[PDB]
């Protein structure tokens, strides 16, 4: 399966600045990569799909980039509701769907 390694393991940032989140892939997934959010106690949420298209109801401050191996997620403005644990999504070569290990984005 296409393993998904997220770097760094923990991103500690103050609100109001730029945030970056990476998720490397062992196999080139072309562009079929997505990102997810996870509050403690809430349901997951689909923000961007296919690494460029944002979903309906998602704020425009979330944006992703990458094609093939290296994929990065960029948040333009860190608001108070953006803190949580973030995951990366592959769907290119899946008989198993493989998630990332997670990047815990917190308040410093």
């Amino acid at each position: 399966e296409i393993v998904l390694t997220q770097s760094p393991g923990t991103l500690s940032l103050s609100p109001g600045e730029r945030a970056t989140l990476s998720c490397r892939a062992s196999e080139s997934v072309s562009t079929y990569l997505a990102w997810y959010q996870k509050k403690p106690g809430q349901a997951p949420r689909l923000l961007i799909y296919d690494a460029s298209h944002r979903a309906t109801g998602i704020p425009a401050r979330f944006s992703g980039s990458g094609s093939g191996t290296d994929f990065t997620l960029t948040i333009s403005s860190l608001e108070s509701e953006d803190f949580g644990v973030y995951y990366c999504q592959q769907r290119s070569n899946w008989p198993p769907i493989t998630f990332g290990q997670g990047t815990r984005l917190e308040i410093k």
Binding site: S30, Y32, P95
Partner: peptide
Amino acid sequence: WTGMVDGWYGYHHQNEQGSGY
């Protein structure tokens, strides 16, 4: 299919052991 680069025409296999183009 934007993930298809090896030709104009093709396939999308998916089974128990693989998927892709």
